[PDB]
Design a protein around this ligand. Structure first.
Ligand code: HEM
Ligand code: HEM
Ligand SMILES: Cc1cc(N)nc(CCc2cccc(CCc3cc(C)nc(N)c3)n2)c1
Ligand SMILES: Cc1cc(N)nc(CCc2cccc(CCc3cc(C)nc(N)c3)n2)c1
Ligand SMILES: C[C@H](O)[C@H](O)[C@H]1CNc2nc(N)[nH]c(=O)c2N1
Ligand SMILES: C[C@H](O)[C@H](O)[C@H]1CNc2nc(N)[nH]c(=O)c2N1
Ligand SMILES: [Zn+2]
Lengths: 407, 411
């Protein structure tokens, strides 16, 4: 019932009580741990509503008050009458902020409470969606001084009228499968890019083509929009010592903005809720650049450093990896685009865990995702036991829309 | 019930049926995953099912399930349990059991080698001098002048829990740590406690940075006894770097032979509380963890100083740079001295092949991602992108409490 987590570097022991509130399931059993798997009615709705409003009214220290009881009856009467309900602005902001607070895979949560929430529940068309998104992009980018934000389109109704952003990120690069046999640009986005072309996009067929938005409103067929180029801040990648690095033609965008997830607050489902923060360096340098199935540039870089690639044991991949990552961080810092390195981000998360344990009785965390994909054991999160459990409000995956949507 | 695991780099999808033969629990529930928790006297009643289950596995593997030899062995074990309250394994059952414990070790990336294991049966051992001799022979055979060979030595099983055989050392070869009055540590901070015990038991500590610890050996539940491994048997590698000539002047070396001596081997319900085993190192065990943990030799600062990295801002990745050069040095040193070692690229690639073969032939390969992914350069190794399923098969290696916490001192 009370659970302990030890840090094996500092011997610090923390007691988790928060997990008893856990309200969704993990995919694990006593017979099998699924910790490393990527993806494991009016009656239903009121408990969910109650559960959330109880926590909300607890947070403003008004639990069991008149205002609390009144709201609970209001929502009860709204559900029984309308089969759903609407969140007050204060509730909405709280729910979004907590969805991030509870994201067990997010290392950047020390920032959870500084989230700008843009209420787009009045949106009705894809064109409106595009306006709301451009404003989000520009507000968050902030000339390089990045600011966390989320924009929240209308909640699901009968699920025949969903709002969806088809892009997986607001800003991503196209991928085209070539007669050659290889892949030009980002191999992660072939299927979506093809979908764009099929809906009508004029693809330029470059390596770093910013994808168009594909926006679905009120269950309708989605439409294409190009984000004003002047709103998409990009960074050319150079190395502080290797002059030749720039000759790779590498760039990345400043704004990371996940657009394909579902926000669940008090039982209500917000299927279009793009949110953005700022990058940890390894996300681009290790994953985007080096993943065999991504831009996969290790071989090229190594050659330019003139390393012995005859034998795995010269650690040439590791040598090139560090340099690629040094360059990402240098390039962003020099251009004054907010970025954080894995040492600093994981140290911050450790301070955040301790705060959550002391002020909330715990912090759900998924070690598999929290430990950076390079230099794991020299960051403090490596040695930190973590308990992973599912709290609501939350962000959830949802099927890619082209699998669901009927045209 | 079938379970799928996907590789996100290759899209290879595998199907596990083997998790169905799982007995022991995980620590996880439907409501909480404990997959990153480090550490998540049997009756007759409990013993016979465990025996039967083991002997069923064994007779299947030799293609003799349900033979007369199979039924007779069951009945013979049956009686031995009913009459003596325990039982003895045949040599072949022990070999098989020790190999399977390794095969089943979900946190071990080196399992492609599981069927090549030299088993030394030390169940006739009765004294701590006896154990010492057994362990010297294991050390010599395993070392093999640098061409390392996997081996395990198996001392008599637990009886009433009052007569346990234990090796108090966590590894057969490890360096002393000495906490100084000024609060700093000389040698390996990981071994301070055990070092103190050794000194308390009467070891004369040389007090250097790399002193091989004496063996501390308990036989038959008796108080343990100190023995120095003959230095001629302790293969060491001095650490130097291929391009950086100042690296040797750091004064570093390490031992060639990784040999865990504090785990418990469980076979068919029987508990073997002293069962030291050894293989060979993956380079990152020394260069990432032994040298670079803040709680260990903690050499990252000194190395980066000497490389003249920019150390004012963590964002130079000075730590990451030093870490790679240290690990380059470790592998270069071992290879140059012809001591067996494997890098983390080669080991993880080998593990992925092992894992697919295991799915094809055994219907599964239980695997702990937290432990299998190397502690540097995780995502440019093929395990990072491999979904794994973690579950517990017997035979197995388990932890046990350190014996200085449980031992009843005789005097
Ligand atoms: C502000 C700085 C932020 C940093 C440094 C950061 C960092 C990260 C990183 C490194 C990951 C793992 C990424 C991967 O390997 O794909 C991640 C995942 C995640 N982040 Fe954060 N993030 C930030 C902002 C935000 C915000 C504003 C939100 C939501 C409002 C958010 C929600 C999430 C969620 C739900 C995941 C896991 C998603 C999944 O399971 O696929 N992050 N974050
Ligand atoms: C042949 C060369 C071997 C290699 C390269 C290898 C590699 C490794 C590594 C890197 C670890 C994780 C160690 C740590 O991070 O502390 C490990 C764990 C483990 N190894 Fe292997 N190993 C080898 C041989 C063996 C042998 C011979 C056995 C026993 C017969 C064995 C049984 C285990 C077990 C039970 C664990 C997990 C221990 C735990 O749960 O803490 N290994 N191995
Ligand atoms: C806000 C934010 C801040 C930050 N620094 N980085 C990101 C991008 C990393 C990220 C954050 C949250 C969710 C996802 C999607 C991960 C994913 C999902 C699926 C379905 N398949 C994958 N292979 C990967 N990616 C977003
Ligand atoms: C045969 C073998 C081959 C190889 N390449 N490496 C080793 C040494 C690594 C190892 C293998 C098995 C068990 C342990 C003990 C790990 C441990 C456990 C706890 C509870 N705390 C720790 N700090 C460390 N370490 C052994
Ligand atoms: C807290 C965490 O589970 C712990 O530090 C583990 C993580 N993964 C590991 N992996 C290996 N191979 N060895 C270890 O000691 C650890 N330590
Ligand atoms: C199989 C494994 O679960 C998968 O590779 C995960 C591992 N850890 C990760 N960690 C982060 N931060 N992001 C990822 O996409 C992944 N992929
Ligand atoms: Zn689990």
């Amino acid at each position: 019932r009370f659970l302990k987590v030890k840090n094996w570097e500092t011997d610090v022991v923390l007691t988790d009580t928060l997990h008893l509130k856990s309200t969704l399931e993990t995919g694990c059993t006593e017979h099998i741990c699924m910790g490393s798997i990527m993806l494991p009615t009016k009656d239903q709705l009121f408990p969910l509503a109650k559960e959330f409003l109880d926590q909300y009214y607890s947070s403003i220290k008004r639990f069991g008050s008149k205002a609390h009881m009144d709201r609970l009856e209001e929502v009860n009467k709204e559900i029984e009458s309308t089969s759903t309900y609407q969140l007050k602005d204060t509730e909405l902001i709280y729910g979004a902020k907590h969805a991030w607070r509870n994201a067990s895979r997010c290392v950047g949560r020390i920032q959870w409470s500084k989230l700008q929430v843009f209420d787009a529940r009045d949106c009705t068309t894809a064109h409106g969606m595009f306006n709301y998104i451009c404003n989000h992009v520009k507000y968050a980018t902030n000339k390089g001084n990045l600011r966390s934000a989320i924009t929240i389109f209308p909640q699901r109704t009968d699920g025949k009228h969903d709002f969806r952003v088809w892009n997986s990120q607001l800003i991503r690069y196209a991928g085209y499968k070539q007669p050659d046999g290889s892949t030009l640009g980002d191999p992660a986005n072939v299927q979506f890019t093809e979908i764009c072309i099929q809906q009508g996009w004029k693809a330029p067929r470059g390596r770093f083509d910013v994808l168009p938005l594909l926006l679905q409103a009120n269950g309708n067929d989605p439409e294409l929009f190009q984000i004003p180029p002047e709103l998409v801040l990009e960074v050319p990648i150079r190395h502080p010592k290797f002059d030749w690095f720039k000759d790779l033609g590498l760039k990345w965008y400043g704004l990371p903005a996940v657009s394909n997830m579902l926000l669940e607050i008090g039982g209500l489902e917000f299927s279009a809720c793009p949110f953005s923060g700022w990058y940890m360096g390894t996300e681009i340098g290790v994953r985007d650049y080096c993943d065999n199935s991504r831009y996969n540039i290790l071989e090229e870089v190594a050659k330019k450093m003139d390393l012995d690639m005859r034998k795995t044991s010269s650690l040439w991949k590791d040598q090139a990896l560090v340099e690629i990552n040094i360059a990402v961080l240098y390039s962003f810092q020099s251009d004054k685009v907010t970025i954080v390195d894995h040492h600093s981000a994981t140290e911050s998360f450790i301070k955040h865990m301790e705060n959550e344990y002391r002020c909330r009785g715990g912090c759900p965390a998924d070690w598999v995702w929290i430990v950076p994909p390079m230099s794991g054991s020299i960051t403090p999160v490596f040695h930190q036991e973590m308990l992973n459990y599912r709290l609501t409000p939350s962000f959830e995956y949802q099927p890619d829309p082209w699998n669901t949507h009927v045209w």
